[PDB]
């Protein structure tokens, strides 16, 4: 259990671009967009960092300091603080979500303004696009592709239903809880769908990262 270990450091500070911003801060998007644009290709970059929930999740100072919000850098595999982090480093669970419900209805699980409030039904469904590209056009059949989407998303929260739609090169992932959809959107954006066992793994950065958006 994540409760029985310290959160792992995911990256060294020196691997990240300077002027590291606060996750809820004024400049986060300027900084992150600049980061993204530094990568080659015209299509969405494939992030060199990734959350590995089992390996990475653990206690942080946030767990002991009354923190209710989750670490955005953690979700993206790029928190350099590990157990020093004042935000949470685990996958949101029912208990966390209950506490968040009492605390706010305008902020997401990361402490940012909710998407719905700047453009009653809580949206818990994500559109996942660019699947073929995130596999470097590997020849997989639908059963295999579905298994991969299910695997990576199910480790980010309780899944209500998942659908892979071959004709549209996309998937739809509906979570039981909005908090997990919020978390998973940040975790999976720009990710590869390749696995270490794939012949293509070493060349994963030549793909195009997953497109993950709120579904209609
Ligand atoms: Zn963190």
Query: How many angstroms is it from 89 CA to the middle of ligand 1?
Result: 6
Q: What angle do CA 6, 12, 15 make, to 5 degrees?
A: 150
Check: CB of residue 184 under 8 Å from CB of residue 157.
yes
Task: For the chain, state the CA radius of gyration.
Answer: 17
CA 189 – CA 212 distance, rounded (Å) = 5
Q: Give the number of other Cβ atoms within 10 Å of residue 210's Cβ.
A: 24
* Residues in the chain after which the backbone breaks (C–N beyond 2.5 Å): 119
Q: Report which of 102, 106, 78, 75 is spatially closest to residue 88, judged by C-alpha positions.
A: 75
Q: Where are the alpha helices (DSSP H) in 80-141?
A: 94-103
Check: CB of residue 210 under 8 Å from CB of residue 126.
no
CA 171 – CA 138 distance, rounded (Å) = 17
| Experimental technique | X-ray
Query: How many angstroms is it from 9 CA to the middle of ligand 1?
Result: 8
Query: How buried is residue 62: exposed, middle or buried, by Cβ count under 10 Å (0-12/13-18/19+)?
Result: buried
Helix, strand or coil, per DSSP, at residue 156: coil
Query: How many angstroms is it from 71 CA to the middle of ligand 1?
Result: 5
- Delineate the domains of the chain, giving CATH numbers in brackets: 1-119 (no CATH), 120-216 (3.30.70.330)
Query: How many angstroms is it from 59 CA to the middle of ligand 1?
Result: 10
Query: How many angstroms is it from 171 CA to the middle of ligand 1?
Result: 29
CA 174 – CA 53 distance, rounded (Å) = 19
């Amino acid at each position: 259990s994540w409760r029985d270990k310290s959160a792992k450091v995911q990256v060294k500070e020196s691997e990240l671009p300077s002027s590291i911003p606060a996750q809820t801060g004024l400049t986060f998007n300027i900084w992150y967009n600049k980061w993204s644009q530094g990568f080659a290709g015209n299509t969405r970059f494939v992030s060199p960092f990734a959350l590995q929930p089992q390996l990475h999740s653990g206690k942080t100072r946030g767990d002991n300091d009354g923190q209710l919000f989750f670490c955005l850098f953690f979700a993206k595999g790029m928190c350099c603080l590990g157990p020093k982090c004042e935000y949470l480093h685990h996958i949101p669970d029912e208990e966390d979500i209950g506490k968040l419900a009492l605390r706010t209805e305008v902020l997401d699980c990361f402490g940012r303004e909710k998407f719905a409030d700047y453009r009653r039904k809580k949206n818990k469904t994500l559109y996942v696009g660019g699947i073929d590209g995130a596999l470097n056009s590997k020849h997989l059949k639908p059963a295999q592709i579905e298994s991969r989407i299910r695997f990576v998303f199910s480790r980010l929260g309780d899944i209500d239903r998942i659908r892979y739609v071959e004709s549209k090169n996309c998937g739809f992932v509906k979570f039981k809880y909005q908090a997990n959809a919020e978390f998973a959107k940040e975790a999976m954006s720009n990710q590869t769908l390749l696995l270490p066992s794939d012949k293509e793994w070493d060349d994963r950065r030549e793909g195009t990262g997953l497109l993950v958006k709120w579904a209609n």
